[PDB]
């Protein structure tokens, strides 16, 4: 179904979401003073 | 928590959720399966 | 000075990257009752300040 | 004048959460593929003005 090439795309994508997603916490705290335990429970509710 | 920071996390959470169904249109633009063939891979990752 | 498994992986992010400043400009201007052309320039021209 | 306050707000916002995620999308990238962040950067400085 999925390629060697379109698997190699996704699974970098993905990764790199996955940081992305991880940088916004530690951002957002720092930002927002919060600790990273709220703000993740934040976004895991909607 | 602050009133001016839901506005801080409910941007960035219509924000992220735009984001990620662009790149599920580009991603079936520049791989060529459907939208569909994606979002489903990108949940069974978890 | 690179490599080709290591300038693909930059040109993808390259092609993402920019396909997600067009998007959000877009959603943007649905957002903030402005056009595409404004926003496109207020941003990156603050890299002018 | 031509932009709200309450639109700069967002604007200003996205400016900063831009600039934050291109400097950590470079060390993930600096530590992935073994280059660092004065080549990944400028290999992106490169592409911008056309490649
Ligand atoms: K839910
Ligand atoms: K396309
Ligand atoms: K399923
Ligand atoms: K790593």
Do not use: A, P, V
Not at 4 to 16: A, H, P, S, V
């Amino acid at each position: 179904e999925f390629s060697e090439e379109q698997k190699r795309t996704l699974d970098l994508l993905f990764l790199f979401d996955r940081r992305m997603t991880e940088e916004r916490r530690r951002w957002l705290s720092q930002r927002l003073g919060l600790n990273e335990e709220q703000i993740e429970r934040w976004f895991r509710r909607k």
